Amino acid sequence: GKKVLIVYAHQEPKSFNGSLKNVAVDELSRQGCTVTVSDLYAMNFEPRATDKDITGTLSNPEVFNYGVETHEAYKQRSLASDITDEQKKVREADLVIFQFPLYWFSVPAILKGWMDRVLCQGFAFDIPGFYDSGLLQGKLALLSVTTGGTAEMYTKTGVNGDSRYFLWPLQHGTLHFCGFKVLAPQISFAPEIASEEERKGMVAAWSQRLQTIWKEEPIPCTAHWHFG
């Protein structure tokens, strides 16, 4: 009985991200997993980190510090319900898949806000309690990314540099920081110019991999797997 959370950030159901998300739902479910989906755009998820994220009264009214206030709110069960809803989903998940098109070598703002607001201190990490000692230890995480740029453009000698440059902030900076074990990202390069067959090739590749997903080795997340 494995739980899976797919955090999904595309505006369009009939999109290539959309298909990757659907396949993952279908395949994983077929194996007896419980798959929950956070369809950020459909939820019209709030990306701004504001004082409205605390329901209670503020630890300090005159000066607002988002980090400090959300920390306190987490422990005191005073965070806004949309945040706590996500946290619950994350908490129960054995695996968290992030499904998104690359925007500016990163996640779309709506998914960046989910990270900013959901992964708060006390919940995803603490001091001490980060990187290997992070609070979400024991959970698995996979980035499923699509790109406009082709694979060659994402090499050490392409116009974009190596892909591990855009993976760093998310995989090390964010996921490893919270204690996740990061599986190899799934990157579908340039589906928009790919052919019908290659697109299906790509969707098929994702489907296949998901079959044996729970047997995979977490990548060694360090400053040697991304720039060397």
Ligand X SMILES: Cc1cc2nc3c(=O)[nH]c(=O)nc-3n(C[C@H](O)[C@H](O)[C@H](O)COP(=O)(O)OP(=O)(O)OC[C@H]3O[C@@H](n4cnc5c(N)ncnc54)[C@H](O)[C@@H]3O)c2cc1C
Ligand Y SMILES: Nc1c2ccccc2[nH+]c2ccccc12
Find the binder of its own copies among 151, 159, 204, 205 (CB under 8 A). Answer: 159
Query: Does residue 169 interact with ligand Y by CB under 6 A?
Result: no
Amino acid identity for residue 151 in this structure: A
Residue choice 91, 94, 105, 113 for contact with ligand X (CB under 6 A): 105
Between 74 and 177, name the residue whose CB sits nearer to its own copies: 177
Q: Is 174 among the residues that bind its own copies (CB under 8 A)?
A: yes
- CA–CA separation, 3 and 95 (whole Å): 7
> Does the footprint of ligand Y cover residue 212 (CB under 6 A)?
no
Q: Locate 125 and state its tokens.
A: 């990490």
* Mask for 158-197, x = binds ligand X (CB under 6 A): ---------------x-----------------xx---x-
Q: Which does 30 bind (CB under 5 to 8 A by kind): Zn ion, its own copies, ligand X, none?
A: none
Q: 214: how many CB neighbours lie within 10 A of its CB?
A: 14
Q: Which does 142 bind (CB under 5 to 8 A by kind): Zn ion, ligand X, ligand Y, none?
A: none
**Rounded least distance, CB 1 to its own copies, Å:** 31
Choose the stretch contacting Zn ion; rule: CB under 5 A; options: 37-45, 95-103, 104-112, 176-184.
176-184
Whole-angstrom distance, CA of residue 201 vs CA of residue 79? 43
Question: Contact between 201 and ligand Y (CB under 6 A)?
Answer: no
Residue list for the binding site: 10, 16-19, 102-105, 125-127, 146-149, 154, 172, 176, 192, 199, 221
Residue list for the binding site for substrate: 125-127
